[PDB]
Amino acid sequence: DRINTVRGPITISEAGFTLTHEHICGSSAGFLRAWPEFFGSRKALVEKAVRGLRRARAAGVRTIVDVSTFDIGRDVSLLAEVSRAADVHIVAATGLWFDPPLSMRLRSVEELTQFFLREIQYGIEDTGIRAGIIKVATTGKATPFQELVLRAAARASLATGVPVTTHTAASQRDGEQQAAIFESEGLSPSRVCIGHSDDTDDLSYLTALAARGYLIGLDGIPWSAINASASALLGNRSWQTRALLIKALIDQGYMKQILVSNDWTFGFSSYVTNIMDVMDRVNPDGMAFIPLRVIPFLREKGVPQETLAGITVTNPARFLSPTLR
Amino acid sequence: DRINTVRGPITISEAGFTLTHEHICGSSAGFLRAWPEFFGSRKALVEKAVRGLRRARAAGVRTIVDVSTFDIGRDVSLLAEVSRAADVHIVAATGLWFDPPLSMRLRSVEELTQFFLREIQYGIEDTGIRAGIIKVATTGKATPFQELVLRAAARASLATGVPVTTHTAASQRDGEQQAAIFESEGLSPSRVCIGHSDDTDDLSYLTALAARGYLIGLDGIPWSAIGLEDNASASALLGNRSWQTRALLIKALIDQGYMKQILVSNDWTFGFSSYVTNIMDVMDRVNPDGMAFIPLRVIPFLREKGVPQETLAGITVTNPARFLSPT
Ligand SMILES: [Co+2]
Ligand SMILES: [Co+2]
Ligand SMILES: [Co+2]
Ligand SMILES: [Co+2]
């Protein structure tokens, strides 16, 4: 039941404090290799990533789950280099996000299942690095292709025991549609995380999924823009409003169904040019925002350490551990 | 006299018979590295590519211009490996086609000009291999992003002298909007090939572009789905126009007095992942000659139709030579 990382298999006890939805670099397939000067240089991106992960480590984080898929420009060699120099375990991902190229979008469910399985059972590229999580996406009502991906992600999870994590348009209640698709394939709700759930205030949506066994991804707490580009991406809602949703779900009793993270990055190319510079101004803490700002905020709101350590250590370790239920 | 190939700089006299629009692998950025099993294996694709290029070489081909851009999944390491093993010069490309990812789509004209210049002046990725052509595209009326890419291509061409080649929806007469954008930037027509021009029978459209100095890419001569109208996917891609109809356009433009403006190719590939699954198998059944189709079938066909050997040698050797030479 060992969890696969970019450096090799680790046990449940070695995982520790885990951020379930992070990115070393938010890019596009082949971009980092073709145009490293966009990030200054590859060396400059590595140096920035090592510094940010070491800051996260000093604050308490032992493992981060890089949910960067093929189309988000996942570079496992970059992930391996920064994991080694920072002494933070990184769990790599397979799956598809909302920017698949023609070679991915014209594939059948059988073919996409084989691709996700290739990255989990054999390895990513020629590196032998196996993925320990599957990332998928929907932005409103699922397109015939997005449904096909969710099904392929479910089938790949049922043959390996590896978990599935999603990107949602939470306000449009995507988690319910994704649920219906995952359940029709026979996937256990305990192997799924309905991510970006901190984008909505609808508690009757979050509790309904958490009661069925789904893990709720309140994975982007520092995302706030309190000018168009930063506002359209990060949103109008504050970090406190997103952190009060962690509190609200513990008050509903569904404490064991919570996964917290930052959804941060050290390189961003899939959006406008200076978005990374604006993001580093909004949150200078980076990935260290959860143990330095969110946890002490929840402690001052009435949530004990036994509960917060269960959300950060026990919940991700149970989520990442290969099993069918 | 000098052009950049995947094996390094060569003199233009060494280029010889050149196919101006080919692909070793029609894919997507990062696809070949992440899923080589789609093509059997990377080794299987290489061996298939080497066999095909060696057969094309035995038929007379000395150089092919791989117009695969970043988003067509250009893997220059593969291009170099196959070029060396087959002993056929391969010119690599920069530019952007019609499947750019978000990291390319959100860029400004200035940023894309810098990316194209990097691949031409510095190198592709960390390989040191420099692009000798810029490939761009439109599929009907140009989107604001396509117009931006064409401007960046024009600016990269003006600074380096490397030619620009295009994908067009010839039936929509795309070459005219492309030409208008290129000339508004000050780019000379002699540095541009309006490709996929064999997809139209409109001689008025072709001759007018040729009269302005544009090179006309009659680049997919074996593309035909005749006999397989049963297959919806093969018909939508390959079309229902015969290889003979496509080849007769070469003769039509020669007869109009535009022999110096013609560039001929197959637009072939050894790996195809950017469309339906078994398309490569279907294509190999329609044309077993592959890239060798031009010298084995098209040249003897045109000779039998009355076109002199010297005119055909001028189209396959002299025209690509003048086109690829930086100026
Ligand atoms: Co997301
Ligand atoms: Co994310
Ligand atoms: Co084309
Ligand atoms: Co082509």
Swiss-Prot record, chain A:
Q: Which PROSITE patterns does the entry mention?
A: PHOSPHOTRIESTERASE_1, PHOSPHOTRIESTERASE_2, TAT
What biotechnological or industrial uses does this protein have? Has attracted interest because of its potential use in the detoxification of chemical waste and warfare agents and its ability to degrade agricultural pesticides such as parathion.
N6-carboxylysine: residues bearing it? K135
Indicate which residues the UniProt annotation says bind Zn(2+) 2. Answer: K135, H167, H196
Manner of cofactor binding, per the entry note: Binds 2 Zn(2+) ions per subunit.
Q: Which GO annotations describe the biological process of this protein?
A: catabolic process
Top-level enzyme category: hydrolase
How is it modified post-translationally? Predicted to be exported by the Tat system. The position of the signal peptide cleavage has been experimentally proven.
Q: Does the keyword DNA-binding apply?
A: no
Q: Which sites bind Zn(2+) 1?
A: H21, H23, K135, D263
- Keywords in alphabetical order: Cell membrane, Hydrolase, Membrane, Metal-binding, Plasmid, Signal, Zinc
Q: Name one Pfam family in it.
A: PTE
Per the similarity annotation, which family is this? Belongs to the metallo-dependent hydrolases superfamily. Phosphotriesterase family.
Q: What role is this protein assigned?
A: Has an unusual substrate specificity for synthetic organophosphate triesters and phosphorofluoridates. All of the phosphate triesters found to be substrates are synthetic compounds. The identity of any naturally occurring substrate for the enzyme is unknown. Has no detectable activity with phosphate monoesters or diesters and no activity as an esterase or protease. It catalyzes the hydrolysis of the insecticide paraoxon at a rate approaching the diffusion limit and thus appears to be optimally evolved for utilizing this synthetic substrate.
The record's note on quaternary structure and interaction partners says: Homodimer.
NCBIfam families, from UniProt? organophos_OPH
Under which name does UniProt file this protein?
A: Parathion hydrolase
Q: Which organism is it from?
A: Brevundimonas diminuta
**What broad taxonomic lineage does this protein's source fall under?**
Bacteria, Pseudomonadati, Pseudomonadota, Alphaproteobacteria, Caulobacterales
This protein's encoding gene = opd
From Swiss-Prot, chain B:
Similarity section:
Belongs to the metallo-dependent hydrolases superfamily. Phosphotriesterase family.
Q: Which UniProt keywords apply?
A: Cell membrane, Hydrolase, Membrane, Metal-binding, Plasmid, Signal, Zinc
What is this enzyme's catalytic activity, as reactions?
Answer: An aryl dialkyl phosphate + H2O = dialkyl phosphate + an aryl alcohol
Q: Does the keyword Mitochondrion apply?
A: no
Annotated Zn(2+) 1 binding sites = H21, H23, K135, D267
Which domain of life does the protein's organism represent? Bacteria
Which residues are modified to N6-carboxylysine? K135
Q: Which PANTHER family match?
A: PHOSPHOTRIESTERASE-RELATED, PHOSPHOTRIESTERASE-RELATED PROTEIN
The record describes the protein's role as: Has an unusual substrate specificity for synthetic organophosphate triesters and phosphorofluoridates. All of the phosphate triesters found to be substrates are synthetic compounds. The identity of any naturally occurring substrate for the enzyme is unknown. Has no detectable activity with phosphate monoesters or diesters and no activity as an esterase or protease. It catalyzes the hydrolysis of the insecticide paraoxon at a rate approaching the diffusion limit and thus appears to be optimally evolved for utilizing this synthetic substrate.
Recorded GO CC terms = plasma membrane
Q: How does it assemble?
A: Homodimer.
Residue sites binding Zn(2+) 2 per the record: K135, H167, H196
List where in the cell it is found.
Cell membrane
A matching Pfam family: PTE
| Biotechnology comment | Has attracted interest because of its potential use in the detoxification of chemical waste and warfare agents and its ability to degrade agricultural pesticides such as parathion.
Q: Which residues cross the membrane?
A: none
Q: What is this protein called?
A: Parathion hydrolase
In the record, what lineage is assigned to the organism producing the protein?
A: Bacteria, Pseudomonadati, Pseudomonadota, Alphaproteobacteria, Caulobacterales
One function term, GO molecular function aspect: zinc ion binding
- What kind of modification does the protein receive after translation? Predicted to be exported by the Tat system. The position of the signal peptide cleavage has been experimentally proven.
Q: Name one GO biological process term.
A: catabolic process
Location (main, coarse): membrane
Q: Where does this protein come from, organism-wise?
A: Brevundimonas diminuta (Pseudomonas diminuta)
